[PDB]
Amino acid sequence: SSGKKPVKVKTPAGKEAELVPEKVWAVAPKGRKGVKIGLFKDPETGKYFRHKLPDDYPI
DNA sequence: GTGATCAC
DNA sequence: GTGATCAC
Numbered sequence A: 001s002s003g004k005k006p007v008k009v010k011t012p013a014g015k016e017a018e019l020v021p022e023k024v025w026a027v028a029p030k031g032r033k034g035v036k037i038g039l040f041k042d043p044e045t046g047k048y049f050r051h052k053l054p055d056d057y058p059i
Numbered sequence B, C: 001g002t003g004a005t006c007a008c
Helices: none
Strands: A007-010 A016-019 A023-027 A035-041 A048-052
Touching (some): A007 A035, A007 A048
Antiparallel strands (some): A035 A048
């Protein structure tokens, strides 16, 4: 699904930013919690990167 | 090792 | 076809 709320992330360029992820999803093996991942675009570079989402971010 | 995703 | 994202 696509994100709605902004997320506090560290961009690849090394800066803190508040970005809305274009896609969010859960990545987890059987039996374990795994992690929530967002796909973000660095507005400074236009480069795409992934980053952990807060555990309560809605998928 | 195992899980999903997609820009490259 | 995979880098890179994390937690357990």
